[PDB]
Design a protein around this ligand. Structure first.
Ligand SMILES: *[C@@H]1O[C@H](CO)[C@@H](O[C@@H]2O[C@H](CO)[C@@H](O[C@@H]3O[C@H](CO[C@H]4O[C@H](CO)[C@@H](O)[C@H](O)[C@@H]4O)[C@@H](O)[C@H](O[C@H]4O[C@H](CO)[C@@H](O)[C@H](O)[C@@H]4O[C@H]4O[C@H](CO)[C@@H](O)[C@H](O)[C@@H]4O[C@H]4O[C@H](CO)[C@@H](O)[C@H](O)[C@@H]4O)[C@@H]3O)[C@H](O)[C@H]2NC(C)=O)[C@H](O)[C@H]1NC(C)=O
Ligand SMILES: CCCCC/C=C\C/C=C\CCCCCCCC(=O)O[C@H](COC(=O)CCCCCCCCCCCCCCC)COP(=O)([O-])OCC[N+](C)(C)C
Ligand SMILES: CCCCC/C=C\C/C=C\CCCCCCCC(=O)O[C@H](COC(=O)CCCCCCCCCCCCCCC)COP(=O)([O-])OCC[N+](C)(C)C
Ligand SMILES: C[C@H]1CC[C@]2(OC1)O[C@H]1[C@H](O)[C@@H]3[C@H]4CC[C@@H]5C[C@H](O[C@H]6O[C@@H](CO)[C@H](O)[C@@H](O)[C@@H]6O)[C@@H](O)C[C@@]5(C)[C@@H]4CC[C@@]3(C)[C@@H]1[C@H]2C
Ligand SMILES: C[C@H]1CC[C@]2(OC1)O[C@H]1[C@H](O)[C@@H]3[C@H]4CC[C@@H]5C[C@H](O[C@H]6O[C@@H](CO)[C@H](O)[C@@H](O)[C@@H]6O)[C@@H](O)C[C@@]5(C)[C@@H]4CC[C@@]3(C)[C@@H]1[C@H]2C
Ligand SMILES: C[C@H]1CC[C@]2(OC1)O[C@H]1[C@H](O)[C@@H]3[C@H]4CC[C@@H]5C[C@H](O[C@H]6O[C@@H](CO)[C@H](O)[C@@H](O)[C@@H]6O)[C@@H](O)C[C@@]5(C)[C@@H]4CC[C@@]3(C)[C@@H]1[C@H]2C
Ligand SMILES: C[C@H]1CC[C@]2(OC1)O[C@H]1[C@H](O)[C@@H]3[C@H]4CC[C@@H]5C[C@H](O[C@H]6O[C@@H](CO)[C@H](O)[C@@H](O)[C@@H]6O)[C@@H](O)C[C@@]5(C)[C@@H]4CC[C@@]3(C)[C@@H]1[C@H]2C
Ligand SMILES: C[C@H]1CC[C@]2(OC1)O[C@H]1[C@H](O)[C@@H]3[C@H]4CC[C@@H]5C[C@H](O[C@H]6O[C@@H](CO)[C@H](O)[C@@H](O)[C@@H]6O)[C@@H](O)C[C@@]5(C)[C@@H]4CC[C@@]3(C)[C@@H]1[C@H]2C
Ligand SMILES: C[C@H]1CC[C@]2(OC1)O[C@H]1[C@H](O)[C@@H]3[C@H]4CC[C@@H]5C[C@H](O[C@H]6O[C@@H](CO)[C@H](O)[C@@H](O)[C@@H]6O)[C@@H](O)C[C@@]5(C)[C@@H]4CC[C@@]3(C)[C@@H]1[C@H]2C
Ligand SMILES: [Mn+2]
Lengths: 41, 113, 158, 33, 109
């Protein structure tokens, strides 16, 4: 089997928890960068 | 009696494909993660950790927007890589975003800090 | 560059002149020799260069460059494991001599995280960085440097 | 094309020149600083 | 014994963190980046299976890498390194974070 012939991550119920984590982390990271540059010490 | 008669049939015996967890437990854990992220954002905003006080104004503002666009932009690129976009198109979009994005981000950081 | 990072530029020029024509390297890089080493000995050196620049300055960018060229070497040659065992040892020794600093934490932690997550993308390597013995030193030093770091902060109180 | 003895002489000349120039550089770096 | 030390450390931390907002930001982020990790491990233990191991490794390594990068940023912000300003530490952090994000998105397939 080739590399692009396996089932995708969004099709296996187990990976659902692991994609959500990654997705949440990335969104939080974007907010952190903005909030970092727009705050004053 | 060999070499002459009919031989019995043979059938391959296949292995077992891995079992997948039932959907409700995965859904519960996704809800847990969503609640956790909502907690993070509300925690940041409630505390003065993030207070949006040093907002750029004037010409610096546009540099700020360019920095923001470069940051979100790369993320979007990666997401489209996650959806099925090739690696060559990904490298080309990354170069096209990274030249002027780098210029604008360096100017913003050099002028606001 | 690496020898300029060690002593100075004159020593670096001597080292370059030496390595240009020394037979121990020419034995496996003669025109026609198209084996894995033809590029590996290059990448190795580059990696080490960046790591040195990462270890004494504390830069995150130089540790990221070291990790990227370490990924290049993992993708190019099977003796990458040498580097996977040499960079931790270094750090470990610096811990025993009493020479821990925040630059060490920055450099080593950045290198380990990025290079480890990146070296598992080569299908021939796979999950070996987490299940093999020749990769267990690095991971170990990735834990120790935490316990030290936190402990250092406690030392600031008492 | 180039011969074998010619390529040997060329390699040796390149080496000798390189070593002489690295020695001169080192002498100027060590003396003037 | 250690109770007085812990109390003094708590006072010191609450001081520093409300005298510098950014160190608060970072701290909060790091804490939740621990929480997420814990959650994922809980899932792997509860369901007693590791069918897609690359997916778990990606989801876990993204959290530990973001944590260690934030800690390096915090160390460079509390007491800066000789030849590296705070702007340059922030930009290096951004570049390293983007690279880690890309590698962890490739890992999970
Ligand atoms: C590296 O190179 C080397 C050398 O080139 C490779 O080594 C070869 O590997 C082969 C396997 O891939 C191996 O072949 C097998 O040998 C087994 C042992 O045979 C010896 O012992 C038996 C007694 O048990 C003797 O009778 C026999 O003469 C030998 O001395 C056999 O058991 C295997 O036979 C099975 O497969 C063949 C074809 O696949 C069938 O024709 C045969 O009838 C057997 O089929 C059963 O099993 C398969 C699954 O394996 C089922 O699909 C099938 O339906 C049958 O299942 C029934 O029977 C089983 C009991 O066997 C029962 O449990 C089940 O319920 C069913 O009732 C096969 O012949 C070579 O010998 C070996 N060569 C050497 C020199 O070692 C090596 O693979 C390479 N490495 C790699 C590629 O990584
Ligand atoms: C801010 C900057 C951000 C960018 C960062 C850039 C680089 C990060 C550094 C390291 C990341 C390593 C992981 C990326 C691997 C991409 C390969 C790929 O692409 O192969 C992939 C898959 O094959 C593989 O896995 C096999 C592994 C490939 C081994 C690497 C080849 C060796 C080359 C070494 C470098 C040579 C230097 C250039 C020559 C001088 C093809 O993908 P696809 O075309 O099917 O697209 C579909 C996208 N799906 C899949 C998500 C849907
Ligand atoms: C960055 C630093 C780089 C440092 C240098 C690196 C590598 C060089 C070191 C060693 C390489 C040795 C090469 C041996 C030659 C094998 C072929 C041979 O032997 O040619 C010789 C001939 O030669 C010559 O007359 C060449 C004379 C002068 C050449 C022009 C100067 C060269 C400039 C180089 C760059 C030019 C680009 C300009 C852009 C500004 C054999 O000709 P033939 O009989 O086979 O031709 C067929 C017969 N007709 C002649 C009738 C056609
Ligand atoms: C706070 C942060 C973290 C959480 C997150 O960002 C914000 O917000 C999450 C969403 O909740 C997303 C999930 C929604 C449910 C969705 C079910 C799909 O399954 C479909 O499959 C089709 C084929 O049969 C069927 O036709 C359809 O009916 C069936 O719904 C599956 O593909 C993807 C999945 C699980 C999403 C994954 C990513 C998540 C967790 C997102 C994160 C990035
Ligand atoms: C990069 C971060 C951010 C982005 C994201 O997280 C990681 O990565 C996204 C994925 O792209 C996910 C989608 C995949 C496609 C999938 C199609 C399903 O439907 C199809 O089902 C087929 C058979 O059943 C029918 O043949 C088709 O016609 C029909 O469209 C749909 O149900 C769910 C959907 C849209 C997934 C939802 C979650 C997404 C958007 C994920 C995000 C949270
Ligand atoms: C300010 C915001 C503005 C909106 C946005 O962020 C910034 O910027 C948008 C982009 O324009 C994205 C689109 C790109 C084109 C892409 C084509 C896809 O087709 C794929 O379909 C797959 C199966 O589902 C196949 O496997 C693949 O091969 C095949 O390419 C389509 O499905 C999704 C689509 C339209 C992207 C969706 C997310 C968008 C809208 C992004 C938003 C988040
Ligand atoms: C503190 C340290 C010490 C403890 C440890 O590390 C952390 O924690 C253990 C985990 O329990 C790991 C195993 C889980 C099961 C997992 C199945 C994979 O199988 C895949 O194999 C692919 C072929 O390439 C297929 O394509 C995929 O479909 C298929 O899922 C296999 O590769 C790796 C394996 C066995 C894990 C690595 C080793 C273990 C024991 C780890 C130890 C070293
Ligand atoms: C700045 C960079 C670029 C330039 C360069 O690197 C440094 O420096 C060049 C040298 O000048 C080299 C030449 C030396 C002279 C030598 C004469 C032979 O001439 C034959 O032909 C008749 C001639 O009268 C007779 O019969 C015999 O002398 C003899 O057999 C000829 O074979 C080889 C040749 C020309 C060398 C080739 C490589 C050169 C061009 C070198 C380049 C790679
Ligand atoms: C600033 C610069 C300017 C001046 C210079 O550098 C510094 O100072 C010159 C030297 O005088 C060099 C020559 C030495 C003699 C040597 C004889 C070899 O010939 C045979 O010598 C036998 C001996 O044992 C072998 O047995 C044989 O194998 C071998 O072929 C010949 O190959 C190379 C040659 C001529 C050197 C070339 C470079 C020179 C001219 C150098 C110049 C470029
Ligand atoms: Mn070989």
């Amino acid at each position: 089997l080739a590399n692009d012939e396996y089932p995708r991550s969004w099709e296996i119920s187990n990976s659902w928890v692991y994609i959500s984590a990654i997705c949440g982390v990335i969104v939080a990271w974007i907010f952190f960068v903005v909030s970092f540059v727009t705050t004053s010490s | 009696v060999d070499k002459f008669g009919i031989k019995p049939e043979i059938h391959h015996i296949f292995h077992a494909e891995p079992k997948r967890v039932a959907k409700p437990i995965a859904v519960i854990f996704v809800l847990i993660i969503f609640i956790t992220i909502l907690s993070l954002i509300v925690t940041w905003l409630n505390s003065c950790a993030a207070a949006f006080n040093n907002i750029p104004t004037g010409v610096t503002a546009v540099y700020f927007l360019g920095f923001i666009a470069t940051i979100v932009g790369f993320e979007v690129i990666f997401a489209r890589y996650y959806l099925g976009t090739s690696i060559f198109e990904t490298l080309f979009s990354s170069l096209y975003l990274g030249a002027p994005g780098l210029l604008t981000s360096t100017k913003f950081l050099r002028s606001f800090g | 560059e690496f020898t300029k990072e060690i002593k100075d530029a004159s020593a670096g020029l001597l080292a370059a002149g030496f390595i240009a024509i020394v037979p121990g390297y020419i034995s496996r890089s003669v025109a026609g020799s198209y084996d894995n080493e033809a590029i590996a000995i290059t990448l190795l050196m580059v990696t080490f260069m960046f790591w040195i620049k990462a270890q004494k300055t504390g830069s995150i960018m130089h540790a990221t460059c070291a990790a990227l060229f370490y990924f290049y070497m993992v993708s190019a040659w099977g003796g990458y494991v040498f580097i996977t065992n040499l960079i931790p040892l270094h750090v470990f020794l610096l811990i025993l001599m009493g020479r821990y600093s925040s630059k060490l934490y920055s450099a080593y932690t950045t290198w380990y995280a990025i290079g480890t997550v990146a070296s598992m993308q080569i299908p021939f390597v796979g999950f070996l960085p987490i299940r093999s013995n020749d990769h267990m030193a690095a991971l170990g030093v990735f834990g120790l440097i935490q316990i030290v770091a936190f402990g250092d902060f406690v030392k600031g109180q008492i | 094309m180039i011969s074998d003895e010619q390529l040997n002489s060329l390699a040796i000349t390149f080496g000798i020149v390189m070593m002489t120039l690295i020695v001169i550089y080192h002498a100027v770096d060590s003396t003037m600083s | 014994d250690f109770q007085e030390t812990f109390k003094t450390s708590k006072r010191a931390y609450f001081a520093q963190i409300e005298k510098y907002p950014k160190l608060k930001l970072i701290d909060t982020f790091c804490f939740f980046l621990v929480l997420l990790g814990v959650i994922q491990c809980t899932f792997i233990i509860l369901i007693r299976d590791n069918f897609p191991f690359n997916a778990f490794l990606a989801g876990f390594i993204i959290c530990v890498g973001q944590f260690v990068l934030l800690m390096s940023l915090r160390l460079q912000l509390c007491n800066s390194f000789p030849g590296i300003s705070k702007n340059r530490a922030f930009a290096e952090f951004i570049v390293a974070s983007l690279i880690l994000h890309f590698v962890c998105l490739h890992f999970i397939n």
